[PDB]
Design a binder for this molecule. Structure first.
Ligand SMILES: O=C(Cn1ccc2c(=O)[nH]c(N3CCC(Cc4ccccc4)CC3)nc21)Nc1ccncc1Cl
Ligand SMILES: O=C(Cn1ccc2c(=O)[nH]c(N3CCC(Cc4ccccc4)CC3)nc21)Nc1ccncc1Cl
Lengths: 122, 122
């Protein structure tokens, strides 16, 4: 009973990543050792179980700075952060493990599973 | 060189609409005559030329209340607001005009064009 716009969701995600590229309405900085990454809490909740659980919590929802455990690999987080904003996963042999272990910490179950299927295909 | 996750963008949009259904991280109320609608500015910028232009403007970006012209049809705005959050357009013969004229006011060019193709198919 309703017309489906099959590329609207990808169009929207492209525009959210535009806004993040320009720092418009970003509302948190993620400290990953020496790196910082600004983002929209909503987009992070929408992609990670770690961030969903942190920010649904009234006690932590209005945080503007999140410090990840300094054991997180910054490249792995950047590749996953970009995945969140583009729906594209840069998996190389060269960083599969770092990405997997970072996607587990971030409670990104489907991405972790894709990494398991990635291993097999090696 | 990158694995494409073909439903990630739709999954994300579903979660943003969950958050809107629960009022998590909503940051504006849209007054349309007697109706109010809470939403995420980012999602509205990502879908409407009116809201993009209002909120990219540093002078208006931190508005928490937008009052639309009381000539806007509230049903038409609700159908378009829901489209923004689901990628589904409820076009009926019964409200095509109201939706079209509301999508023009909101600078939603593709939706307006779909309404023109909708007319033809009548
Ligand atoms: O789904 C995401 C974000 N995302 C994406 C993948 C993924 C993942 O693999 N795991 C989780 N978890 C957090 C909540 C989970 C189940 C749950 C659902 C509802 C209430 C309690 C628990 C378990 C772990 N989140 C994930 N966000 C989201 C979820 C629900 N409603 C709105 C949004 Cl925005
Ligand atoms: O595209 C949307 C939101 N959206 C969705 C459809 C649609 C539409 O049909 N028209 C406009 N207009 C606003 C800006 C337009 C061109 C422009 C682009 C860049 C700079 C100046 C002008 C003309 C009218 N927006 C639209 N948002 C968005 C756009 C760009 N970057 C980030 C985001 Cl979030």
């Amino acid at each position: 009973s309703q017309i489906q716009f099959t590329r609207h969701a990808s169009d929207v995600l492209l525009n959210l990543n535009r806004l993040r590229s320009r720092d418009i309405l970003t509302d948190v900085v993620i400290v990953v050792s020496r790196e910082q990454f600004r983002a929209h809490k909503t987009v992070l909740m929408a992609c990670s179980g770690l961030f969903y659980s942190i920010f649904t919590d009234q006690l932590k929802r209005n945080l503007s700075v999140i410090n990840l455990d300094p054991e997180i690999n910054p490249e792995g987080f950047n590749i996953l952060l970009d995945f969140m904003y583009t729906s594209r996963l840069n998996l190389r042999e060269g960083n599969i493990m770092a990405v997997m272990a970072t996607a587990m910490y971030l409670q990104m179950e489907h991405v972790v599973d894709t990494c398991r299927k990635f291993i097999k295909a090696s």
